Amino acid sequence: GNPVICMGHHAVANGTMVKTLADDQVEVVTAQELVESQNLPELCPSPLRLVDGQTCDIINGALGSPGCDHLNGAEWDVFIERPNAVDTCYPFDVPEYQSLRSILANNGKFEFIAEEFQWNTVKQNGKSGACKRANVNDFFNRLNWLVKSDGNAYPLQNLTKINNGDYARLYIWGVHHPSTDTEQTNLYKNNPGGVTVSTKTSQTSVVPNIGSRPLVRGLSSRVSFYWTIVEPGDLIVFNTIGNLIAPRGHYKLNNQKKSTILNTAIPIGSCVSKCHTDKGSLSTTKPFQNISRIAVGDCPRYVKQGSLKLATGMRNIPE
Amino acid sequence: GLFGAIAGFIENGWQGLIDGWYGFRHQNAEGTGTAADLKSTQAAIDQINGKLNRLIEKTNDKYHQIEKEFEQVEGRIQDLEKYVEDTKIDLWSYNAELLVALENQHTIDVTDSEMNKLFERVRRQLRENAEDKGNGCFEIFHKCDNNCIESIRNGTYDHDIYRDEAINNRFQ
Ligand SMILES: *[C@@H]1O[C@H](CO)[C@@H](O)[C@H](O)[C@H]1NC(C)=O
Numbered sequence: 376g377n378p379v380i381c382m383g384h385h386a387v388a389n390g391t392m393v394k395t396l397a398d399d400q401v402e403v404v405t406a407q408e409l410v411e412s413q414n415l416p417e418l419c420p421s422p423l424r425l426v427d428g429q430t431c432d433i434i435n436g437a438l439g440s441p442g443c444d445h446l447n448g449a450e451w452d453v454f455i456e457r458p459n460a461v462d463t464c465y466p467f468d469v470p471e472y473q474s475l476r477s478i479l480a481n482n483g484k485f486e487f488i489a490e491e492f493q494w495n496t497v498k499q500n501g502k503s504g505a506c507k508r509a510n511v512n513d514f515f516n517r518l519n520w521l522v523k524s525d526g527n528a529y530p531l532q533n534l535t536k537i538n539n540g541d542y543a544r545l546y547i548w549g550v551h552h553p554s555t556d557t558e559q560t561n562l563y564k565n566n567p568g569g570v571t572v573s574t575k576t577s578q579t580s581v582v583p584n585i586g587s588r589p590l591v592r593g594l595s596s597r598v599s600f601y602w603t604i605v606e607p608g609d610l611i612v613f614n615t616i617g618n619l620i621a622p623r624g625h626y627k628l629n630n631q632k633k634s635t636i637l638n639t640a641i642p643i644g645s646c647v648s649k650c651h652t653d654k655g656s657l658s659t660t661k662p663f664q665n666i667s668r669i670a671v672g673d674c675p676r677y678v679k680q681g682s683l684k685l686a687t688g689m690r691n692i693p694e
Numbered sequence: 695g696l697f698g699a700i701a702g703f704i705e706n707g708w709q710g711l712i713d714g715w716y717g718f719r720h721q722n723a724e725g726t727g728t729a730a731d732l733k734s735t736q737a738a739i740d741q742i743n744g745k746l747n748r749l750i751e752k753t754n755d756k757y758h759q760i761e762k763e764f765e766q767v768e769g770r771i772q773d774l775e776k777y778v779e780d781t782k783i784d785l786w787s788y789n790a791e792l793l794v795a796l797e798n799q800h801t802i803d804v805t806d807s808e809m810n811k812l813f814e815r816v817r818r819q820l821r822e823n824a825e826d827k828g829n830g831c832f833e834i835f836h837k838c839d840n841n842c843i844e845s846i847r848n849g850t851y852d853h854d855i856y857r858d859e860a861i862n863n864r865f866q
Pocket residue numbers: 533534535612
């Protein structure tokens with residue numbers, strides 16, 4: 376009696392090292408990498424709607440700067456904002472810059488609504504030498520510069536618009552800041568000037584500052600931009616003893632805001648991927664990624680490790 | 695592993711066995727052979743692929759979040775934003791680290807377990823007709839041709855047919 380039957384298991388010449396609780400270097404027959412460390416050198420326009428701002432950052436696109444006309448009407452899941460965006464107008468500062476930028480990006484669309492404001496004796500459509508769209512002095516096409524009567528007179532102005540629409544409105548208005556006391560009296564009238572924008576709930580007012588400022592743009596004056604949200608059932612009042620960069624309208628606000636902005640210089644390509652990093656899109660089924668903490672869409676979770684191998688086979692013990 | 699079969703009383707694996715994770719290697723009067731065991735192989739693959747599916751696909755569908763890069767420091771608010779993200783990343787890094795370690799520890803135990811279940815299954819088939827040699831091999835105490843060997847592998851082996859011959863060889 377000497378037949379023999381042996382029970383055994385497979386093995387390969389060379390396996391993969393994995394970690395366990397008790398050993399950080401165990402050789403198993405097969406393993407699967409759980410950390411995506413390769414990205415694409417482009418951004419996928421599908422299935423998410425990516426809108427390329429190109430030369431305009433999202434603030435300049437909303438303002439209506441020269442060269443931002445393509446962004447009109449545009450709807451996006453992700454707004455792609457270039458690091459080499461360039462200011463192309465009479466220039467400015469937004470006091471709560473990040474918060475405005477956030478609201479516009481999250482909102483998801485640039486749907487502008489025209490409405491006409493009956494300004495009194497005061498002019499309209501004032502333009503500038505630092506904001507010139509195709510050859511010809513201009514301004515933010517969503518804003519309207521009011522300047523002096525011919526017989527120098529700017530009455531206190533109050534108009535009012537009422538939101539009986541079924542959506543919340545976003546009005547964007549500005550305040551002009553002159554370099555001199557003469558510049559104000561030139562432009563017009565008063566000294567000081569001032570703007571007070573009210574809603575039922577609120578009332579925001581500004582008095583212009585007047586001083587020697589550096590030379591960007593080639594002027595020493597600047598504009599300060601503000602915004603006001605008007606819910607269905609609310610109103611917005613514009614008061615000016617001077618200097619209002621008045622609005623031509625309001626933007627439409629989605630009830631549900633589900634969009635966002637991604638700032639990167641990566642070109643847009645042909646691929647399909649629901650996951651975008653600032654280094655480019657990701658095309659993976661892995662649960663984790665070490666590529667960038669800036670990640671948007673349907674993405675693996677960002678982790679610090681460059682590799683985490685999951686054993687998909689038994690220990691490898693060859694011979 | 696916990697059962698001490700793989701890298702245990704089986705001293706090594708079989709590079710020749712390429713159509714299964716586990717199998718039989720025999721020797722009898724007419725020769726030798728290696729054959730895969732499908733049931734044990736499938737039992738291990740199914741368990742591992744189960745882990746893979748629980749893993750690949752969970753829902754991390756995020757859109758509008760917070761700023762994570764900054765030109766210049768601003769103080770209090772920026773510090774909170776940075777701290778929030780840094781805290782998130784450490785916790786998720788920890789989860790990924792522990793997960794892989796846990797899964798891997800378990801996977802190795804499962805495969806060691808499946809090897810041992812196979813050995814034990816065959817041990818039970820042979821009853822008193824065979825003795826454990828100690829290296830995952832049974833000495834069979836009766837002439838056992840290829841049909842006999844196949845009957846062991848496919849589970850149709852009837853120990854009563856050989857018991858008289860086997861008992862007599864074992865004990866005298
Ligand atoms: C203008 O202001 C007066 C009070 O000074 C107010 O009663 C009136 O409703 C305002 N009209 C508009 C059109 O804003």
